[PDB]
Design a protein around this nucleic acid. Structure first.
Lengths: 14, 116, 129, 70, 205
RNA sequence: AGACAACCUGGCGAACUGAAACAUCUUAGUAGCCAGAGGAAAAGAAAGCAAAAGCGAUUCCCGUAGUAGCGGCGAGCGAAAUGGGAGCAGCCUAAACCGUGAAAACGGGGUUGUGGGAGAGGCUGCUAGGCGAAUCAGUGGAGUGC
RNA sequence: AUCCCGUGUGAAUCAGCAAGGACCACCUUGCAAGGCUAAAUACUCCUGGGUGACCGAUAGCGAAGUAGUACCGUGAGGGAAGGGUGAAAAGAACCCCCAUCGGGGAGUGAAAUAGAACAUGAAACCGUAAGCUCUCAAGCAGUGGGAGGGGGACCAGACCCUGACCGCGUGCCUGUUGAAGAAUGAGCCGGCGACUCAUAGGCAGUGGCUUGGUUAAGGGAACCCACCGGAGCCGUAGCGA
RNA sequence: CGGUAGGGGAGCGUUCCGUGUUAGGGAGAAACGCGUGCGUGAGCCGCGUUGGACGAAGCGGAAGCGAGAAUGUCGGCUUGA
């Protein structure tokens, strides 16, 4: 699984 | 980023109106009055569903009482219920009253062999 | 209607604006785009501010001319119309083919508009040279 | 813009090494003859500000380095 | 993993590339994207408050003894014509992030980008004039495909190759000068040069 | 001579407000009026900083710092030097002396800080322009979309 | 203290004068009472070039239409509203009603359920048509039960419209000890219409670094941005005025 | 597991941006009006008519982001008749 502008999100709680 | 409201208002007020579209006069066609009335309709529904359960029972009791008094001159609903539990017999009021309507023969038959 | 917003854009010095355009009046053209595709005609009148040329007998367009003066019938005059330069294109009439126009400096001092694909000159008509 | 310190209050509340707010006691500037030797000794010394009033003191001056015990 | 090579259309695979990413924090790449996007954003949204409006600073009618509700101004934020209560103003959005967090974020996306990644040997000596035709031919040689998206990391970018590369929209040539985090996410296929691998393997290992 | 959006220099100069009232104080030398001028204006080449170690005209940003302080020691007000940058550039004049009465009114002699003087011994850009690659059809108003 | 001023006084000349936060001494620094001087800095009635997690006709300049107009005011001054037939006017020759207006055929057009009052065309409000249904009723108008009647070109103990008659049921909001209230607010319908932003302080959640951490301005084939900039700030010693 | 002030947790939508000049769309999008689907709800989802060209998700982001009350305010239209 490679990082793209599709995949990204924050971590729970930030 | 100006955000016009547009779509979001009357798409819900249609749904508000969909309820009240059997109501009589102003209540059926006036936004804020519909919004005032729908709530009250739902409240009277919720309130009367619990009134239902006791009121049907109360009807049934009267039916059964009316049925049973036509047997002996002094025999009466109050005694009848205790005579059922004396013999251990778990027929609820609904069944008893509805058979009393639809098949009075069967109430005659239950009355006959409870006494002994 | 005439439409109020949509008119000749005046410059600062009270004059309408114009477009360079590939076409001139003394010219034969094939239509690339629109309803009358492929038909071959000539340019007659030329509205500069729109980039719209008027081809003789092409935009066949009916018109119900009401009687002007007397108690008579008038008649339905089938007239031409305008047509946008981008839709038209420059035909050769040797190979009878369209083109896309280009300029070149000739031995004769003047600058002229040759074609591509049978690059033959299109500059000796109307007033002429 | 960047918080001004409440330099009226600041001058009555110092903070200690471990981080507690400390004040001086009230009473012993004048009319001393009529008080005892005893009570002037208790009025000489510093103690903590009461936990109730920390809120106002910290709120007044916001560059203290003050540790409510955590 | 280990990367691939290409002399000029033919493989001879070697260089490895070691780089340092985190473990259970993709959130770092997300944050590094968001910061990038925020700091760029121009922020030219401007409205007038009831002060700034061109309008009459006067009571229209008296406070008492008319059935009308008490009015302050006609350019009031309840009438149309001048208001906009908490409306946007020419506002900057530039947030900080640390150095090492940015650098780590750049490292992680690259680390996860090997798999799709690619390397070549220098090819700046081919292009005498600028030619897009030959460039696209070399793309189809390597198999990068004018349809898909690509990012050419090129440690020392040459004139003639840059100019030929310019007009391919899907393509995107990058020096270490204009290295970008958005772009390394943007690309489908990365394609390095031997020097680039020395640079990144040194600087982020 | 008048005109001129703001910015700027100089003159005059409020009050509501804050202080839970209010007069010191704050609002503020702000708003307003008045006069003046430029593309910027004002400042500016030490009778200056600083401490026994040093710096070298201004002006602007970061900082020191909400620190030193001031304050019905209340509300509040609030620096600078050291340090990092942006940008740098330095000049002329009067008298003591000289000449044509003499402070009749003109030229020369000099103007400097860990003391200085004179005296006597065509080049490019802008204001017009110019040349400038490569596609065709099916698609039922119209095709660049399929 | 330093700097400048009205009133009155009133020096000295580098063996001098002034400053070093009263003041005196000693050091150090400078030379007041004549002038001039680019840059970095401030701004937008305005011109050119670029950009927009800006507006889209109740928005955006007040002003998308010959707007500071119409209009009001003695006067200073205040101050509106009103965009979208079509690709192309092809804007309806002719016939009928007929003095006009307008209308129906015709014709044009992809469309005239685009005809100039013309594009999408919501609600209130005004009707026309069909299904059921009120003239011994009493009612915040619904709700639970449901008589009798009607369906939908799709064969259901299913579903929808009406609703004989029964039982229950004191409009909403604000704001009160307490409001069906004869306390307040709204004629109705649609739009606009309110805890925001900048900078700091505390706290929590999350992340990075922990060889302590972090850079500010400022520099970047601008803005973001690699990559520099360690000047400062926070933590590493308290105690006492 | 009643609940006003009030605190805490979990969500839905609105326009705009990244992905995206995505697929989906003049064999019909946005809208507009109807549904004998769904959800605890805010809301979602399919429909063929009117409509005549825009533009879903999903993963993320940002606000002029949700209205019935302000003798609110602008426009329309009633009542009294």
């Amino acid at each position: 699984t490679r990082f793209r502008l599709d995949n990204l999100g924050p971590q729970p709680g930030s | 980023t100006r955000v016009k409201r547009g779509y979001i208002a009357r798409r819900r007020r249609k749904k508000i109106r969909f309820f009240a579209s059997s109501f009589r006069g102003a209540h059926s066609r006036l936004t804020r009055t519909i919004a005032q009335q729908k709530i009250r309709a739902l409240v009277s529904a919720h309130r009367d569903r619990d009134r239902q359960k006791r009121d049907f029972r109360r009807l049934w009791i009267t039916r059964i009482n009316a049925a049973i008094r036509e047997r002996g001159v002094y025999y009466n609903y109050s005694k009848f219920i205790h005579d059922l539990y004396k013999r251990q017999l778990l027929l609820n009021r609904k069944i008893l009253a509805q058979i009393a309507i639809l098949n009075p023969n069967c109430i005659y038959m239950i009355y006959n062999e409870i006494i002994k | 209607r005439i439409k109020r917003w949509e008119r000749k854009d005046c410059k600062p010095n009270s004059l309408p604006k114009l477009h360079k355009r590939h076409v001139k009046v003394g010219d034969t053209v094939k239509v690339i785009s629109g309803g009358e595709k492929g038909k071959i005609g000539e340019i007659s009148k030329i509205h500069k501010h729109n980039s719209t040329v008027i081809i003789k007998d092409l935009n066949f367009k009916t018109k119900h001319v009401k009687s002007k003066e007397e108690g008579e019938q008038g008649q339905i005059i089938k007239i031409e119309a305008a047509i946008h330069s981008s839709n038209v294109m420059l035909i050769l009439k040797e190979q009878e083919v369209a083109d896309r126009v280009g300029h070149k400096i000739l031995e004769d001092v003047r600058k002229v508009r040759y074609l591509i694909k049978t690059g033959e000159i299109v500059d000796t008509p109307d007033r002429w040279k | 813009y960047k918080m001004k310190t409440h330099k009226a209050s600041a001058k009555r509340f110092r903070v200690t090494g471990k981080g507690k707010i400390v004040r001086r006691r009230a009473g012993k500037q004048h009319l001393l003859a009529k008080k005892n030797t005893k009570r002037k000794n208790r009025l000489s010394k510093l103690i903590q500000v009461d936990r109730s009033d920390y809120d106002n003191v910290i709120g007044a001056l916001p560059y203290l380095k003050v540790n409510r015990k955590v | 993993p280990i990367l691939n090579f290409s002399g000029e259309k033919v493989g001879e695979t070697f260089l490895n590339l070691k780089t340092a990413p985190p473990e259970k924090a993709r959130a770092v790449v997300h944050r590094g994207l968001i910061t990038h996007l925020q700091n760029k954003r121009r922020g030219t949204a401007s409205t007038l408050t009831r002060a700034e409006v061109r309008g009459g600073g006067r009571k229209p009618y008296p406070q008492k003894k008319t059935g009308r509700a008490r009015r302050g101004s006609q350019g009031s934020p309840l009438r149309p014509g001048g208001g906009v209560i908490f409306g946007p103003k020419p506002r900057d959005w530039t947030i900080k992030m640390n150095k090492k967090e940015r650098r780590l974020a750049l490292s992680t996306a690259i680390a996860s980008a090997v798999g799709n990644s690619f390397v070549v040997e220098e090819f700046a000596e081919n292009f005498e004039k600028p030619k897009t035709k030959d460039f696209i031919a070399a793309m189809q040689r390597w198999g990068l495909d004018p349809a898909e998206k690509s990012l050419f990391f090129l440690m020392d970018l040459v004139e003639n190759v840059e100019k030929s590369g310019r007009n391919i929209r899907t393509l995107k040539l990058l020096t270490p000068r204009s290295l970008n985090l958005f772009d390394v996410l943007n690309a489908e296929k990365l394609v390095f040069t031997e020097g680039t691998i020395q640079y990144l393997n040194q600087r982020y290992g």
